[PDB]
Design an enzyme around this catalytic site. Structure first.
Site, PDB file in Angstrom:
ATOM      1  N   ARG A   9       0.237  14.137  33.755  1.00 51.68           N
ATOM      2  CA  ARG A   9       1.490  13.741  34.383  1.00 51.68           C
ATOM      3  C   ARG A   9       2.564  13.446  33.345  1.00 51.68           C
ATOM      4  NH1 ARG A   9       3.513   8.827  37.500  1.00 51.68           N
ATOM      5  NH2 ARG A   9       4.809   9.739  39.157  1.00 51.68           N
ATOM      6  N   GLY A  44      -7.058  15.462  27.522  1.00 47.58           N
ATOM      7  CA  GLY A  44      -8.410  15.049  27.199  1.00 47.58           C
ATOM      8  C   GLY A  44      -9.291  14.876  28.420  1.00 47.58           C
ATOM      9  N   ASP A  45      -8.698  14.517  29.556  1.00 51.50           N
ATOM     10  CA  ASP A  45      -9.432  14.332  30.804  1.00 51.50           C
ATOM     11  C   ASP A  45      -8.448  14.493  31.958  1.00 51.50           C
ATOM     12  OD1 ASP A  45      -8.085  11.764  31.062  1.00 51.50           O
ATOM     13  OD2 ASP A  45      -9.592  10.963  29.675  1.00 51.50           O
ATOM     14  N   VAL A  46      -8.922  14.246  33.179  1.00 50.11           N
ATOM     15  CA  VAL A  46      -8.088  14.290  34.375  1.00 50.11           C
ATOM     16  C   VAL A  46      -8.257  12.977  35.127  1.00 50.11           C
ATOM     17  CG1 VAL A  46      -7.377  15.656  36.356  1.00 50.11           C
ATOM     18  CG2 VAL A  46      -8.596  16.755  34.471  1.00 50.11           C
ATOM     19  N   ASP A  47      -7.141  12.312  35.406  1.00 50.03           N
ATOM     20  CA  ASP A  47      -7.119  11.013  36.075  1.00 50.03           C
ATOM     21  C   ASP A  47      -6.455  11.203  37.435  1.00 50.03           C
ATOM     22  OD1 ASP A  47      -8.092   9.410  33.690  1.00 50.03           O
ATOM     23  OD2 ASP A  47      -6.228  10.233  32.862  1.00 50.03           O
ATOM     24  N   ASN A  92       1.809   1.281  27.884  1.00 51.82           N
ATOM     25  CA  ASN A  92       1.343   0.181  28.722  1.00 51.82           C
ATOM     26  C   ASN A  92       1.337  -1.132  27.949  1.00 51.82           C
ATOM     27  OD1 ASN A  92       0.958   1.708  31.032  1.00 51.82           O
ATOM     28  ND2 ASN A  92      -1.222   2.063  30.644  1.00 51.82           N
ATOM     29  N   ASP A 147     -11.914  11.271  36.196  1.00 53.58           N
ATOM     30  CA  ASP A 147     -11.906   9.944  36.789  1.00 53.58           C
ATOM     31  C   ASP A 147     -11.164   9.996  38.117  1.00 53.58           C
ATOM     32  OD1 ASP A 147     -12.937   9.544  34.302  1.00 53.58           O
ATOM     33  OD2 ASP A 147     -11.404   8.124  33.623  1.00 53.58           O
ATOM     34  N   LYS A 172       0.824  -1.204   0.000  1.00 51.30           N
ATOM     35  CA  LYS A 172       0.000   0.000   0.000  1.00 51.30           C
ATOM     36  C   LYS A 172       0.860   1.258   0.000  1.00 51.30           C
ATOM     37  CE  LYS A 172      -3.932  -2.178   2.305  1.00 51.30           C
ATOM     38  NZ  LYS A 172      -3.215  -3.220   3.094  1.00 51.30           N
ATOM     39  N   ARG A 181      -9.865  19.198  24.083  1.00 51.76           N
ATOM     40  CA  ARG A 181      -8.933  19.062  25.190  1.00 51.76           C
ATOM     41  C   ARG A 181      -8.895  20.345  26.013  1.00 51.76           C
ATOM     42  NH1 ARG A 181      -5.710  14.694  24.342  1.00 51.76           N
ATOM     43  NH2 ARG A 181      -4.111  15.554  25.738  1.00 51.76           N
TER      44      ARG A 181
HETATM   45 MN   LIG Z   1      -6.623  10.300  30.929  1.00 51.09          MN
HETATM   46 NA    NA Z   2      -9.733   9.085  32.220  1.00 49.95          NA
END
Ligand SMILES: [Mn+2]
Ligand code: NA
Ligand SMILES: [Mn+2]
Ligand code: NA
Ligand code: NA
Length: 316
Positions: A169, A176-179, A258, A235, A62, A136
DNA sequence: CGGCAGTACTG
DNA sequence: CAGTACC
DNA sequence: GCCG
């Protein structure tokens, strides 16, 4: 990225495969796409193609068609439904199965979904924040959110530790979010606080919607006071001090980092989860093993025989 | 041929 | 259970 | 889709 003129066209197929449910093929494409960004040179040959780890036969051909064509054949035969499936799957709580069903039933737009589709409690919250959850936030806003949670938690027991993980971190400019991860040194004072903490955060309007209220995981929506504020995904994970380091590393990510870590653990008869690094080793068709002590992130890298990568360099 | 991770909600 | 989500 |  020496190959944006190649990745741009593969990203179209990748997203098409993922929204259509073909999750392994989509993963394969994703790997290959990140590999070419990582590469130092523009691809120049079919054998320079097969050279990359993550690029095989089929995708060598491709890139080969693209490098002469200036454009790929397969892109002209994408089903007309892909743009709609993507639109639906970008609702939080709606995946490939729900989108394809909605499409089969004739739905074609978010007005259709709002008008005629039955939604779960989670999907209605996702649809209502459809735009907010696609954009974001500045990392400074992530800091106020962590600190908001931290002051609420430390009022009960000030021994509590609270740390924002995720892309924040990893040092990225936007998130995009807060963990937010929470534990307690004394090893027992962390338990049974979601009761009081989430009530306190819900007190003066910080928490706006709940997506998931588990016993250790809370997923929801928050917003800061004042004008100009958008709804942000938040979260909260509470862990025993024993598992602090492993949770710290899993929830800082990234997901591809991960996944690479899990793969290397498998080369050494070990398993890596958000809870523990384990000598669980039996592998011959597919009985867990022993949790190894990991008081710090450093220990996980060490027991895996890796040099410590600080959060900012795991943004794979 | 078959793994590519495991774990936690939700209903 | 299937589906979806977390990194 | 890749790769062992
Ligand atoms: Mn996150
Ligand atoms: Na999250
Ligand atoms: Mn909003
Ligand atoms: Na290769
Ligand atoms: Na979704």
């Amino acid at each position: 990225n020496h190959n944006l003129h190649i990745t741009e066209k593969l990203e179209v197929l990748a997203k098409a495969y993922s929204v259509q449910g073909d999750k392994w093929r989509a993963l394969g494409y994703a790997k290959a796409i990140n590999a070419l960004k990582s590469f130092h040179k523009p691809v120049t040959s079919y054998q320079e193609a097969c050279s990359i780890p993550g690029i095989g036969k089929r995708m060598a051909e491709k890139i080969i068609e693209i490098l002469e064509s200036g454009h790929l054949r397969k892109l002209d035969h994408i089903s007309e439904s892909v743009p709609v499936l993507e639109l639906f799957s970008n609702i939080w709580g709606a995946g490939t199965k729900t989108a394809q069903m909605w499409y089969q039933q004739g739905f074609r737009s978010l007005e259709d979904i709002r008008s005629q589709a039955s939604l779960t409690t989670q999907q209605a919250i996702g649809l209502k924040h459809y735009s907010d959850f696609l954009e974001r936030m500045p990392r400074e806003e992530a800091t106020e959110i962590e600190q908001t949670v931290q002051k609420a938690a430390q009022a009960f027991n000030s021994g509590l530790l609270c740390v924002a993980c995720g892309s924040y971190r990893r040092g990225k400019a936007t998130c995009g979010d807060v963990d937010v991860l929470i534990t307690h040194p004394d090893g027992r004072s962390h338990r049974g606080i979601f009761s009081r903490l989430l009530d306190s955060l819900r007190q003066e309007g910080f928490l706006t919607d709940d997506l998931v209220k588990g016993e250790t995981k809370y997923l929801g929506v928050c917003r800061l006071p004042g004008p100009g504020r958008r709804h942000r995904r938040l979260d909260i994970i509470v862990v025993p001090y024993s598992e602090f380091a492993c949770a710290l590393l899993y929830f800082t990510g990234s997901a591809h980092f991960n996944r690479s870590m899990r793969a290397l653990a498998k080369t050494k008869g070990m398993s890596l989860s958000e809870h523990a690094l384990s000598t669980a080793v039996v592998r011959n068709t597919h009985g867990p093993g022993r949790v190894l002590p990991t008081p710090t992130e450093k220990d996980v890298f060490r027991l895996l025989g890796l040099p410590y990568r600080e959060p900012a360099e795991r943004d794979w």
